[PDB]
From a paper:
The first step in the d-alanylation mechanism of TA is the transfer of the phosphopantetheinyl moiety of coenzyme A (Ppant) to the [name] protein by the Phosphopantetheinyl transferase [name]. The d-alanine-d-alanyl carrier protein ligase ([name]) catalyzes a two-step reaction: the activation of d-Ala using ATP to form a d-alanyl-AMP intermediate and then the transfer of d-Ala as a thiol ester to the Ppant group of [name].
We first confirmed the trimeric assembly of the [name]-[name] complex and brought new evidence that two [name] monomers are required to dock one [name] molecule during the catalytic reaction. The first one is the largest and locates at the interface between the helix α2 and the loop connecting helices α2 and α3 of [name] and the helix α1 of one adjacent [name] monomer. One is strictly conserved in B. subtilis and is established between the well conserved Arg15 of [name] and Asp37 of [name], the latter being located just before the reactive Serine. The Asp32 of [name] located in the long loop between helices α1 and α2 forms a strong ionic interaction with Arg46 of [name] and an H-bond with Tyr42. A clear electron density, corresponding to a phosphate moiety of Ppant, was observed covalently linked to the Ser38 side chain in only one of the 3 subunits of [name] of the complex. In this position, the thiol group at the extremity of the Ppant is stabilized via H-bond interactions with Glu49, Asp82 and the well conserved Arg46 of [name]. Our finding that the [name]/[name] cannot form a complex when [name] is fully Ppanted provides the molecular basis for the dissociation of the [name]-[name] complex allowing subsequent [name] binding to [name].
Numbering used by the authors:
A (entry chain A): 1 to 119
B (entry chain H): 4 to 80
C-alpha cells in the first residue's frame, strides 16, 4: 500500500464568518444534507468553526485527490461527520482507498490534513 | 453587457483591485484570488445574476483569468 496523495489546509475563520454574515448560501454550497443538519443545530461561534473546518477538510482532500475542487471532485462528493465520540471520519468520498482526515482549530484558525493511500 | 460589467465588479470586490485592464492575469498564481474566493465567486454569480454554476462545471484551469471567467459566464447566460 503506498501514498497516493496528501493535502493540508489552513483557513482563517473570519473569512468564513464574513461570507456567512453577508447572508450568502455558503452552507448549502459546501455541506452535504447530513453535514448541513449538524451545522443547523450549532450556535454561531460553533457554526463558523464547523463550516470553516468542512471547507478546509474538503479543500485538503481535493489536493490529496490530485485536482483541486472542481469537475473531478466537488464539495458534495465528500462527507465528514463526527463520531458519537466526536471523531471525524470521511464517511463518503470518491477515492478507492483509505482516506485519513484530521482537523484542529483555535478561536481564529482551522487546520486540516488529508492523506490518501492506494492498495 | 451588464453581465460582463457585473462579473468584473464581483472580481474587483473579491481580489481588491480593478482587473478590467488586466483581463489575462492569472488570478490564482498572483495570489489575488484563492479557493475560498472562487467559491464566493460562485455564490455571487448566483446571487447577483441568477446564474448558478455547479461545481462540476468549475475547473480552476478554465476559470483562472478574468477574460476566461467572463466568457464562461456570458455563455451560461
Ligand atoms: P486556495 O488554495 O486557492 O486558497 C489559498 C488560501 C489562502 C485559502 C490558503 O489557506 C491555502 O491553501 N494556500 C495554498 C497556496 C500556497 O500556499 N502556495 C504557496 C505555494 S505556491
Amino acid at each position: 500500500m503506498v501514498i497516493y496523495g496528501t493535502g493540508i489546509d489552513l483557513t482563517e475563520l473570519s473569512r468564513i464568518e464574513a461570507i456567512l454574515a453577508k447572508g450568502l448560501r455558503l452552507p448549502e454550497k459546501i455541506l452535504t444534507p447530513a453535514e448541513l443538519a449538524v451545522f443547523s443545530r450549532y450556535p454561531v461561534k460553533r457554526q463558523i468553526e464547523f463550516m470553516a473546518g468542512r471547507f478546509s477538510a474538503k479543500e485538503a482532500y481535493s489536493k490529496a485527490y490530485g485536482t483541486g475542487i472542481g469537475a473531478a471532485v466537488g464539495f458534495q462528493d465528500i462527507e465528514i461527520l463526527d463520531n458519537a465520540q466526536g471523531k471525524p471520519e470521511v464517511t463518503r468520498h470518491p477515492f478507492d482507498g483509505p482516506a485519513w482526515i484530521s482537523i484542529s482549530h483555535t478561536d481564529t484558525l482551522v487546520m486540516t490534513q488529508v492523506i490518501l493511500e492506494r492498495g | 453587457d451588464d453581465t460582463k460589467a457585473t462579473v468584473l465588479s464581483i472580481l474587483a470586490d473579491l481580489t481588491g483591485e480593478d482587473v478590467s485592464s488586466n483581463m489575462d492575469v492569472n488570478l490564482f498564481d498572483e495570489g489575488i484570488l484563492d479557493s475560498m474566493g472562487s467559491v464566493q465567486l460562485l455564490l455571487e454569480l448566483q446571487n447577483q445574476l441568477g446564474i448558478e454554476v455547479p461545481v462540476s462545471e468549475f475547473q480552476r484551469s478554465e476559470w483562472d483569468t478574468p477574460a476566461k471567467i467572463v466568457a464562461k459566464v456570458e455563455n451560461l447566460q
